[PDB]
Every structure is written in structure tokens, then in C-alpha cells.
Structure 1
Amino acid sequence: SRNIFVSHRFPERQVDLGEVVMNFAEAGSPDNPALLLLPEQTGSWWSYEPVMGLLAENFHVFAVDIRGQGRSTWTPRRYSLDNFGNDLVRFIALVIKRPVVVAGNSSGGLLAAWLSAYAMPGQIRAALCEDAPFFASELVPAYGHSVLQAAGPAFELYRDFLGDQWSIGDWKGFVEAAKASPAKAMQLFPTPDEAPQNLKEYDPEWGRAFFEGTVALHCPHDRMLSQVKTPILITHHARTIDPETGELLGALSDLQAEHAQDIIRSAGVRVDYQSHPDALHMMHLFDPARYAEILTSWSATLPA
């Protein structure tokens, strides 16, 4: 329907980028440094709603709905990291019109790195990659677990039961397949009787693109990390190896994080790594005060 939205504590506006009309919320005062917040997959801008007040003390915050999510345009067959990233390049150029710190969670953290490497010159001051699945979200990664061995199971179910643009919509089937899944990474997957608000706002073709290896086909992660041009902060939250299946539970393994750091270091840019092994994947949502402190303290070490 694309008519299922609810109210939020910050006003929302939309901007025509040329193909996507991007929805976003704004917080904070425009005399403060600009901060672009990129949600996790299945998450709308309001994934950041609880933390935006804290960040508004110090930043001019723009939290966006990425294409295929929230009130931003759904674009069948066009889901790629490059299209996600170029939408954001346009958003910075058309809306923000200043250099930004960009912070993103999970797939959004992939896009924060993408911008550090591939944005227009001067657009990106620095990038915060909050529990980003470097390598582990690729179909054939250079290192470690692939998407099939990590976050893939839920993506397969989104595709098979919800379908591209919610064209199947079989939430009841999805829940019963999620409960029956032998993937240990599905063990704590929430299975409410009714689809949650964030999933109702989510184009499940996103999940297809991740599961099928098309989203990053043209953006191998080893190459993209070698092309970053700004300081990078990597936060690395909970992760474990399942002792029955060998699945990666979490965003990326220790080995994948080591390689991501090594590649960035070899590009000659500043890289900082923080391991928070008892934090949840979406620390900006489940521990806003800790996330805000991490981001604010690191941002204060960046050159003006």
C-alpha cells in the first residue's frame, strides 16, 4: 500500500533526488557539524529516533530512509550498494550542502564506508561503521563467512514469504518458517503475530539482493575498503561462532574485522577499532547513550 506509516517525534521531509524521493528527519541546530545517520537493513530513519535527541546536543542530524525503506521510493530491480550510495551523494549535495560525518549501522555502515571511498570530493569528513558486516554480507567474500553462513537465513525467508515489494505478503508463513528454521542465527528471531512496523516499511527485495549476491556484486568489499579516503571508526559488537553449525552470529568475525582494519591501514587513512563484544547489533537503538558517547568522543578527535 505504501500507506502504512505512523507518527514520530521529529518532523519528516522528502527530497527528489532524480529517481528516488528520499524521506528524512532532522534534529539539532544548523550551526553544529552535520551528521548523516544511515539505518540498518529493515530499519527506517527512526531506528535513530531514541538517540537523535542526544546527538542533537552537538550535531545537525539528518536521519534518512534509504531507497527501498520507509517513505523513500521502492525501486524494483535496482537494489545495489552503488545505487544506495549515489542516492546519499545526491542527498548531501541537494539537502545538506556541507561536509558530513556519516554513521551507519550494519548495511548502513557498509554505506558509510562506501561514501568514504566513492562520494564526491569533500562530501565526507569521516565515517562511523557501527557493526558493519564487511565480508560476511558478501556471497563470496575475500575472507571468512559468507552471507549464506551468517545473516542470509532471514533474507531467504523475506524473499520466499514476503516477496519483492511485499508482493507475496505471507507473514504467517514467514513466522512458521522462521520458527522451524534449522539456522541457529534464527533462534532469537522475533516472530510476532503481526509484521512489525519496520518490516512493513521494508522492501524485501533488499533481502533477495543480499541473499543472491547481487547487492554488492559491483562493490567487492576488499576493493572498497582499499579505496576509503577519510578516517574510519569500526565498532564491533557481539559475535560468536555457533558450536553446532559453525554459523556466524553477529555482523562479522574477528578475522573479517582484522582484515578490514589491515586494508584500511594499507590505504593510508586513519582507522580506529572498538570492540564492544557484549553490545547488541543495533547499539544506537538499544544503548543510545553509549552510542552517542562513542560517536561524539570520536568526532571530537577529527580535524576541523
Structure 2
Amino acid sequence: MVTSPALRDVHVPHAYPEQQVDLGEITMNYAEAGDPDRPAVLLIPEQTGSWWSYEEAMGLLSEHFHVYAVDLRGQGRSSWTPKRYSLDNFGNDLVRFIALVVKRPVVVAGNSSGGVLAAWLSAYSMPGQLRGVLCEDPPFFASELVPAHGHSVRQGAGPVFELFRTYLGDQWSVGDWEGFCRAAGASASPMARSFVADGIPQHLQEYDPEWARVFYEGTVGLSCPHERMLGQVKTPVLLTHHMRGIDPETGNLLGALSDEQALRARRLMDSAGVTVDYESVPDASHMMHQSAPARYVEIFTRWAAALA
């Protein structure tokens, strides 16, 4: 057997056993850590990341919390659903996971697009499902094609998403890794180059690149403008803001969101009447939970421990 991303037979073992749940349209794959009597935490990966993006952080959080880490649809061992990728479908999948698996109020932490989905749940979950959310370096506004504030996706991560769409393809239908690496290495985007490797990185083998299409094309959030979601949050919010800057050659955003976009997000969430904490860590990498797990967990724990 020659395995392939398109055939979805690429998965490998990890430090925690995996479980699956039927949510109706999809099956969600996930893993669990910690004492089930301790407060529940739901971890949402960044785009291209599976649940095991949190593997090291899970071991540290297990000191105090009952942790669930999930594969979103289009990722990992969860269902791939051509033509169905939207913030509302990702979000409602997570509402169902809470109702069907967790069965208790949760603290949610999500990285990047996962942090956009953490804010989505704060605003749009079923009543009483959430105690608070941590949005770890989220591209508020900057992941939209037509944002209310600041740089668009085409002026931020879009160059990478375009390469994923063109060289990898929906459901890995093209799979031209050599052409991806050629184009990426010649790109003006540093982030594009960070995926260049001899072989396809494991997390990307598990990723449905239709995700990149719906971000690039502005369809993933067409029915979910960020200004309305942010102004309707209903729980405490912790917003962590990592490296960010401007590329001189193009004017494009480096990092997840600009200082302007973070300010506007903070004002909107304040107007919603919730408690907002903002932690600027301008020296931290995008996936702090992976590059500096102890630092991430200390931030999360100090904040979560004071919730309820």
C-alpha cells in the first residue's frame, strides 16, 4: 500500500489514544487528557493543525484540567466535507461536540483560525455551554476577504492559501508537492517558506486544502462578518497577540493580525459587555502552545483559574 493524503490513509500514532463521535453530518476525531472531574477545556487547532498540535500542552494542562483536543472537519481523522467549509459549520460542529461528548460547560482555547472559532462559540454557542474563551493569535479581520478594519486576507496569509489551493488542491486532488515548494521558495511571504520541506509535513498530509480555498476566496466567512461576531460575544475573552509586523517590499501584514485590528476587536468585545483580557507577546511565535508550551499553559491557567 502506497499511502496518500487524498486517500486519507496517512495517520500515525500519538501520545494519547484517539476517539471518534458521530455528530450527524460528520464524525469528529479527538483525544482526551487529565482527570475527568476537573474543569473541562476544549482545544481547537490552527488551520492545517490536527488535535496533536496540542500534544505537549495537553500534558501540562492535565495538571489542572480535563482536556479535549479536536480535529475539525477537513482535518486529521474527522470527516472531509467537500463544498461545506464555513465558520458556521465548523462552529456548529463544536457546539455538537460539547453537547454530545463534554456534557459540561467548557473553557475554549483556539489558535489562529481556531481562535476565530473560539470567539464564534463565545457569541453563537448554545446558552450556558461556555465559561470563557482564549483566542491564541487569531486573525480577526485579517482572515476576511473584505474586513471592516485593516488588512484583508489577500494582504496577509492569502499568498500561502493561494499556493495550497493551486499546488495541493481540494481534497489533495493535485498534490504537486514539488511545484508547491518551487513556488513557495520563490514567494515574498516568509510564512509560505516555513512549509517548504523535503517531504510533506505530517500535519499537512492530514489537511483538506479546500480550507485554503475558502479562506482565499472569501466564502468561509461570507455569512459571518467578524465585526458582528466580536460585538456579540457573551463570555470572558482572553486575546493573545504574538509576532506581527509589516513587510517593506509589499506592505503586507506579517503575523495573525495588526495592532489596529486587535484594538478594533477589543473595542467591539468591550461593547458586548464582557470581560476582555489582552496579552501582547510580541516575541512569541504564532503557535506558542507548540513552540513555548509552558509559557502558553501559564497564561491560560492564570486566566482560567480566575473565571468561575
- In the superposition, the TM-score normalised over structure 2's length comes to 0.97
Per-residue CA shift, 1:172-230, capped at 9, x if unaligned? 111101011234553x4231111100000000000000000001101100000011000
Which of 78, 82, 99 lines up with 2:105 in the alignment? 99
Contact 1:184 1:247 in 2 (8 A): no
Which of 59, 62, 77 lines up with 1:56 in the alignment? 62
In the other structure, the counterpart of 2:3 is none
What residue identity is the alignment partner of 2:122?
A: S
Contact 2:106 2:131 in 1 (8 A): yes
In the other structure, the counterpart of 1:234 is 239
In the other structure, the counterpart of 2:202 is 197
SS in structure 1 at match of 2:46: coil
Mapped to 2, the partners of 1:184 and 1:108 lie a distance apart of 21
Mapped to 1, the partners of 2:196 and 2:283 lie a distance apart of 23
SS in structure 2 at match of 1:25: strand
What residue identity is the alignment partner of 2:40?
A: A
Mapped to 2, the partners of 1:189 and 1:290 lie a distance apart of 23
Mapped to 2, the partners of 1:63 and 1:72 lie a distance apart of 12
In the other structure, the counterpart of 2:93 is 87
Per-residue CA shift, 1:145-164, capped at 9, x if unaligned? 00000011110011101000
Mapped to 2, the partners of 1:295 and 1:70 lie a distance apart of 25
- In the superposition, the TM-score normalised over structure 1's length comes to 0.98
| Alpha-carbon RMSD | 0.8
Mapped to 1, the partners of 2:130 and 2:178 lie a distance apart of 43
Q: Tell me, yes or no, if structure 1 residue 212 matches structure 2 residue 213.
A: no
Mapped to 2, the partners of 1:197 and 1:288 lie a distance apart of 20
Deviates further, 67-76 or 176-185: 176-185
Contact 2:159 2:189 in 1 (8 A): yes
What residue identity is the alignment partner of 1:146?
A: S
In the other structure, the counterpart of 2:40 is 34
* Alpha-carbon shift at residue 86 of structure 1 (Å): 0.2
Contact 1:113 1:228 in 2 (8 A): yes
In the other structure, the counterpart of 1:147 is 153
In the other structure, the counterpart of 1:16 is 22
Mapped to 2, the partners of 1:189 and 1:215 lie a distance apart of 24
Task: Give unmatched runs, 5+ long, in structure 1.
Answer: none
* Alpha-carbon shift at residue 245 of structure 1 (Å): 1.0
Structure 1 moving runs of 4+ over 2 Å: 182-186
SS in structure 2 at match of 1:91: helix
Task: Give unmatched runs, 5+ long, in structure 2.
Answer: 1-6
In the other structure, the counterpart of 1:294 is 299
Contact 1:127 1:233 in 2 (8 A): yes
Mapped to 2, the partners of 1:219 and 1:128 lie a distance apart of 19
What residue identity is the alignment partner of 2:202?
A: Q
Contact 1:15 1:22 in 2 (8 A): yes
Deviates further, 95-104 or 239-248: 239-248
In the other structure, the counterpart of 2:258 is 253
In the other structure, the counterpart of 2:269 is 264
Mapped to 2, the partners of 1:148 and 1:31 lie a distance apart of 45
SS in structure 1 at match of 2:132: strand
Identity of aligned residues (%): 71
